[PDB]
């Protein structure tokens, strides 16, 4: 599971002094992130994109506003 960093921390230190500091069990809102591993058939989740494949180092070069790539038949 891959998501970006948790940066927009809401100021819960401005009215008291991530709901972990206290249905209340499913209010979360950060999103968890595990580490990736290469050259083995895994179930990947890149920022809401789900599949099953073998993740390998690439050679293509994107543009710095783009997230993923497709092909002629529009498969990721």
């Amino acid at each position: 599971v891959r998501f970006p960093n948790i940066t927009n921390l809401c100021p819960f230190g401005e009215v008291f002094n991530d709901y972990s500091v206290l249905s209340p069990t499913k209010l979360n809102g950060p999103k968890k992130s595990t580490n990736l591993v290469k050259n083995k058939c895994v179930n990947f989740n890149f920022n809401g994109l789900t599949g099953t494949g073998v993740l390998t180092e690439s050679n293509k070069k994107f543009l710095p506003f783009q997230q993923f790539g497709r092909d002629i038949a529009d498969t990721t």
């Binding site: 293509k60 543009l63 506003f65 783009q66 997230q67 993923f68 790539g69 497709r70 092909d71 002629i72």
Partner: protein, 40 residues
Amino acid sequence: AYTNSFTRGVYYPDKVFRSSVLHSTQDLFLPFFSNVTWFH
């Protein structure tokens, strides 16, 4: 006053990498050879 564009107003509709792919799309664009209003 008026003038036109001759080829203007084309933006990237999505965040998808494609390489040497002709790709049709249907979105909100500026037509070719279309009149725009001059200003000062």
